[PDB]
Each structure stands twice: as structure tokens, then as C-alpha cells.
Amino acid sequence: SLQLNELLNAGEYKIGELTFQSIRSSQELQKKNTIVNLFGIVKDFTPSRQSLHGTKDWVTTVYLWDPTCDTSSIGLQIHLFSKQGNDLPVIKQVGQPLLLHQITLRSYRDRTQGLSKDQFRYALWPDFSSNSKDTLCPQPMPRLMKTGDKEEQFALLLNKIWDEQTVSFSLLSQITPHQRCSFYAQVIKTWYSDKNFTLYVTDYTENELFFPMSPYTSSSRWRGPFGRFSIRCILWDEHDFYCRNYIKEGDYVVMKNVRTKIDHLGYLECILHGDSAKRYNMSIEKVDSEEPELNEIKSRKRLYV
DNA sequence: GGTTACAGGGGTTACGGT
């Protein structure tokens, strides 16, 4: 179980006679497009179907996970393509181990993305942990690979590791552009508007890329903290409706799996986009004032009172 | 080398106090 971890945590590894990369590493935003070989498990998949525009290629889309990501993340987005016919992976159920030889990574919308090479191969195993015995179904020949002994071990582990496991919290000083992160914070300020909800929140730790709140402005109802101790969060859709008249100035919140972003004028922000498709599993929820996880915040607050 | 498939998806100036 650990021999798996050990190789993964390197970022790159090898089975049979070819070299893999882990998912987390691979999610690195590479500007230059490179040739990767992947192995993980299908946390989400679409049916193969012909695409309607351009070359109109056959296309299935999948999200490969491994232990270098948290159990919350679906993982790396990969679109597989076939110009030659419908020889794409026939995926039954989640938790199927999937190897993918000869995929490319390419960044888009500030998110690293898999795109398959024309001559891509794959190999696919069942969801061993399922009661159902038919979780693999027969696969199109053209793009298979006869997998060796070692990789079939790997497959049973990944399904096990996944099955058991189905977060990592930061201070606000520790968050950087374009990441998914989780944190406790107290609310300083809110602003509803027609089109969204906004929270200004803090854990009383300075982040370079936060706005510097002046003590010297006139007629501000912000009483503190001053400088770069507060992030703005923007809640869309369901997150708006739940918080708009629920979360209030001075509440202590815990926010899970939010996405960070630099706004137009160059300050780091939090976005919770609407997420109907149960994909990102982000949350924001009130925390009881006397909780032990909140006392590090309270203490820090004395130091800026 | 990266349309198709993505989606989603979007909002003034650190106040305004809606």
C-alpha cells in the first residue's frame, strides 16, 4: 500500500517498462504541452458519442484520480478522441482503474487539461470493490494494451485505496492564486446584490495578495482588521441563496474546497461557482463559537485589537 | 498539435450599508 504511495509522492514513477506521472503533479499548469502516460481511477466519465462540430471526432471525457489528490477532488480532466471510429474506453462504473498511454496536457481556463494523442492506447480494469461482478465490459480492440503482471497489482490497490477513502486546511496566509483550498475564518462584512453574495472574511493572518485596508479612510463601517488580513469571497447560485440571509457579520465559518482567483485589479479572491453537478463538493458552514478549531483565530484577534 | 468536448460561469472600486 505504501510502495504505491512512495513512487507516487515522487511525482513520476514506472511499471512494466514505461513511466507514469501522478495526477496531482500533472495538474501543474504547464504552459508548454508535453506527452504524458497516466494511471489512476475514473472518478467521473461521459458516454462516447460523435462530436457535432469540426472533425466531429468520437469523444468520451473522463476524470482520473489518484492518492496524490484529496478524496474531494475529481482529479484531472481528460478528453479522449477517435477520428478512426468508436474505439474509446467502454467505462461502466466509477472506481475502474484506467491506464492511458500517450496523452497530452494543455492548460485552458487556468485549469490543466488532458487531450489524447491520435495514436493513444489505454487499459481498463473493473471496480473490484463492487458487488456487481460485471463492472468491466468487453472493450474495442484497436487501442487496447496487454498489461503485464505488475500493473494489475497497481489496479487492485488503487481501487482499494479509493474505496476506503470514499481535507487539508490552510491559513489564509498560505493560499495562492489558482488553487482549491479549505479554511476557517471569521466574517467581517457582507454585501448582497441582485446577482451574487459577497463575504469579507479573515483568520487574522496577512496575505500579500489581499487588499490593504486603510485605517485612515473616512466614513467606513469596517472596524478591522487593517492591512492585508481579509479575503473577499464571491458566492454564486446555491451558495448565494443559502448564505444571503443566513451568514452574518461576525459569524465563524468553515469553507471547504473553494477556488482562489485574482480579480480584475489584482487582488486574490475566493469564488464558489454554482455546482449543480455535485462535482466539486465545496461547502461553507457556520461553526459554533466555542469550537476548539476556532481558538487559534480568537487568540490572533487579541493581537490586533 | 489541440475545434469537437468542456460548459457551467456571471460582478463597483475596499465603499456601498443597499
Author numbering: 8 to 173, 199 to 337
Can you list sentences taken from the study reporting this PDB entry?
The conserved shelterin complex caps chromosome ends to protect telomeres and regulate telomere replication. In fission yeast Schizosaccharomyces pombe, shelterin consists of telomeric single- and double-stranded DNA-binding modules Pot1-Tpz1 and Taz1-Rap1 connected by Poz1, and a specific component Ccq1. Here, we report the crystal structures of Pot1DBD-single-stranded-DNA, Pot1372-555-Tpz1185-212 and Tpz1425-470-Ccq1123-439 complexes and propose an integrated model depicting the assembly mechanism of the shelterin complex at telomeres. Overall, our findings provide valuable structural information regarding interactions within fission yeast shelterin complex at 3’ ss telomeric overhang.
Next, we crystallized Pot1DBD in complex with Tel18 and determined the complex structure by molecular replacement at a resolution of 3.0 Å. The calculated electron density map allowed us to unambiguously trace most of the complex except for a disordered loop between Pot1OB1 and Pot1OB2 (residues 174–198). The overall structure of the Pot1DBD-Tel18 complex reveals that Pot1OB1 and Pot1OB2 pack in tandem to adopt an elongated conformation, and the ssDNA-binding grooves of the two OB folds are connected with a kink at the OB1-OB2 interface. The telomeric ssDNA Tel18 meanders along a long continuous groove on the surface of Pot1DBD in an ‘S’-shaped conformation with its backbone exposed to solvent and its bases partially or completely buried in a solvent-excluded contact area of ~1,900 Å2. Close inspection of the Pot1DBD-Tel18 interface reveals that G1-C6 and G10-T18 are respectively recognized by Pot1OB1 and Pot1OB2 almost in the same manner as in the Pot1OB1-Tel6 and Pot1OB2-Tel9 subcomplexes whose structures were previously determined. In the Pot1DBD-Tel18 complex, the Pot1OB1 moiety recognizes G2T3T4 with high specificity, defining the binding register of the first telomere repeat (G1-C6). Compared with Pot1OB1, Pot1OB2 confers only moderate sequence specificity for nucleotides G11, G16 and T18. Trinucleotide linker A7G8G9 in Tel18 is the most frequently occurring linker sequence in S. pombe telomeres. This short nucleotide linker adopts a highly zigzagged conformation and is sandwiched between the two OB folds, with the bases of G8 and G9 stacking together on the plane formed by G10 and the side chain of His305 from Pot1OB2. Here, we consider that the structurally separable Pot1OB1 and Pot1OB2 together with the long flexible loop between them endow S. pombe Pot1DBD with more flexibility capable of binding degenerate telomeric sequences.
